[PDB]
Structure 1
Amino acid sequence: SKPQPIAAANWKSGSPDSLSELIDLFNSTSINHDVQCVVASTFVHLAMTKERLSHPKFVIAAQNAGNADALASLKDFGVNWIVLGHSERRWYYGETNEIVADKVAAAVASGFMVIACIGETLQERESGRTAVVVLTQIAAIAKKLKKADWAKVVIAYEPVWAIGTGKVLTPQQAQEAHALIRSWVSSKIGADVAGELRILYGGSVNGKNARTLYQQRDVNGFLVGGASLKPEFVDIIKATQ
């Protein structure tokens, strides 16, 4: 068995029109297994997904929160999930491992479910440094969490060089990264926490490659950017069965 999977859409563009039709598609889709679906977006789409996205298996999420005022206003707005630490926050805007970890801790304290992102750059991968970089990232997050807080955290493992580039990990490479992360959590945090933790893969997931990725033992679902703007996101949800 695995914990409950997550199928998360990450909307980083799109037309208003294109995306309320996607919400209507999601609302009309039959999902017959236990999966938590998530639609993360900016303020552009959140009033609409809060109101319009009716499917029982879906929740909405914010894509980021800059400060404590924003965390509190998003919660009061009705948002209970948030993505933190995503790719560009770290490498384009300069958030350190510790700033990401404090944001995760603050969000958990405020009552969010948090999708905390980790992942290595092209150079870190090719120079053999994936394990050291990614385990350093998650270690910083863990330093700010108490044992019981892990029930509110989800890890998204995303190679930076796979996000939006058409370069996806092979099933074996995804499984090796996720098994590494799982082993670190089990040793440092506990087998109980490791077995309940969702570790999602993201980085060019699409409806054709999702099933074989999901079949890997340590993959618990996906964080999906480009393919979540398209009807194939429904098949990515189906791939988590």
Structure 2
Amino acid sequence: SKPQPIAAANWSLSELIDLFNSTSINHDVQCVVASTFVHLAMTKERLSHPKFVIAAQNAGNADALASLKDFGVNWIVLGHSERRWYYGETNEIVADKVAAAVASGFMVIACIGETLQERESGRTAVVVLTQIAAIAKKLKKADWAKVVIAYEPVWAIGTGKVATPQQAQEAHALIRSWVSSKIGADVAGELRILYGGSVNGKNARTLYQQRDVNGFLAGLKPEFVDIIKATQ
């Protein structure tokens, strides 16, 4: 079957945490709320639903990771679109951050995905695989137990243009096949590969029906509750 799905939200927050706390989740799914540093203390005090964990974002400094782990933060999101295309994190910088976090005791959601022009020009496979290859170069087989991949076409992030179920499935299958081949079929079988980019509740349910989709990365908004419900 499928491994345990994940629904993850990348950063009124108080009403939002209230909604989440009051939500009964009647299937096995790991929920994650990722937030900036300034909101972590409040979110940890406030978010009490035991199927949720708090996650940091983008921390790359060893002392910082150590400090987060001491604080009780065990998850982190790395390599998200704007980190690459705006801030200028290279495939290698993202890979070093992923390795550093794993070494520091984190579960890591590492984001990969192609740009608009890369998709249009047929370069999706080469781009996405080069990105995960860089990540894999810095990890050992055993580390994959602490890794979750989020595939997000940049052209689908915040644009209201989701990938069709077929586009999403093809990307996830390509990633999983590469993981099987290069890392191991055992690792590939347990690997969560999440889809991100303009997910909502309706489109989420349909996307989850695809063979190689293991959940979602989406915005911290009220409809995240529907995205959670869609992971079955």
TM range (shorter): over 0.9
Structure 2 gaps, min length 5: none
Structure 1 SS opposite 2:202: coil
Distance in 2 (alpha carbons) for counterparts of 1:97 and 1:198 = 20
User: Cα deviation per residue 1:70-127 (whole Å; 9 max; x = unaligned)?
Assistant: 2122112221100111111111111111111111011001000000000000000000
Shift of 1:229: 3.6
Q: Does structure 1 conserve the Cα–Cα contact (< 8 Å) formed by 2:60 and 2:100?
A: no
**Aligned partner of residue 209 in structure 1, secondary structure:** helix
Are positions 1:228 and 2:219 aligned together? yes
Residue of structure 1 aligned with 2:180, choices 183, 186, 195: 186
CA positional deviation for 1:66: 3.6
Distance 2:195 2:128 in 1: 13
TM-score (norm 1): 0.94
CA RMSD in angstroms comes to 1.0
Deviates more, 1:69-78 or 1:92-101: 69-78
Q: Structure 1 residue 45: deviation in Å?
A: 2.0
1:228 Cα offset (Å)? 3.7
Moved more, 97-106 or 40-49: 40-49
Residue 197 (structure 1) shift: 0.2
Match of 1:72 among 66, 77, 96: 66
The CA distance in 1 between the partners of 2:220 and 2:68, in whole Å, is: 23
Q: CA deviation at 1:240?
A: 0.3
Aligned mates of 2:92, 2:31 — CA distance in 1:
28
Encode CA deviations 1:123-172: one digit per residue, 9 max, x unaligned.
00000000000000000111111111000000000011111111100001
Contact 2:10–2:34 (Cα < 8 Å) also in 1: yes
SS at match of 1:59: strand
CA distance in 1, matches of 2:4, 2:133: 23
Looking at structure 2, the residues matched to 43 and 122 of structure 1 have their Cα atoms a distance apart, in angstroms, of: 30
Count of residues in correspondence between the two structures:
232
- Comparing 73-82 with 1-10, which one deviates more in the overlay? 73-82
Match of 1:28 in 2: 22
What is the TM-score normalised by the length of structure 2? Answer: 0.97
What runs of 5+ residues in structure 1 fail to find an aligned partner?
12-17
Q: What SS does the corresponding residue of 1:208 show, helix, strand or coil?
A: helix
Q: Which residue of 2 aligns with 1:214?
A: 208
1:230, distance to aligned residue in structure 2 (A) = 3.0
**In 1, Cα distance between the equivalents of 2:221 and 2:99?**
33
Give the distance between the partners of 2:224 and 2:149, measured in 1 at CA.
20
* Equivalent-residue separation in structure 1 for 2:28 and 2:223 (angstroms): 19
Task: Answer with 41-50 or 188-197: which moved more.
Answer: 41-50
In 2, Cα distance between equivalents of 1:30 and 1:89: 34
Partner SS state of residue 76, structure 2: strand
Deviation digits for residues 22-73 of structure 1, max 9, x if unmatched?
1111111110111000000102321122111111100000111142222122
Secondary structure in structure 2 of the residue aligned to 1:31: coil
Tell me, in whole angstroms, the C-alpha distance in 2 between the residues paired with 1:102 and 1:178: 23
Q: Find the aligned partners of 1:24 and 1:104 in 2 and give their Cα distance.
A: 31
Equivalent of 2:81 in 73, 84, 87: 87
- Aligned to 2:73, the other structure's residue is in SS state coil
Contact residue 33 and residue 220 of structure 2 kept, 8 A:
no
Query: Percent identity over the alignment?
Result: 99
Name the CA shift for 1:66/1:148 in 2 (closer, same or farther; >3 Å): closer
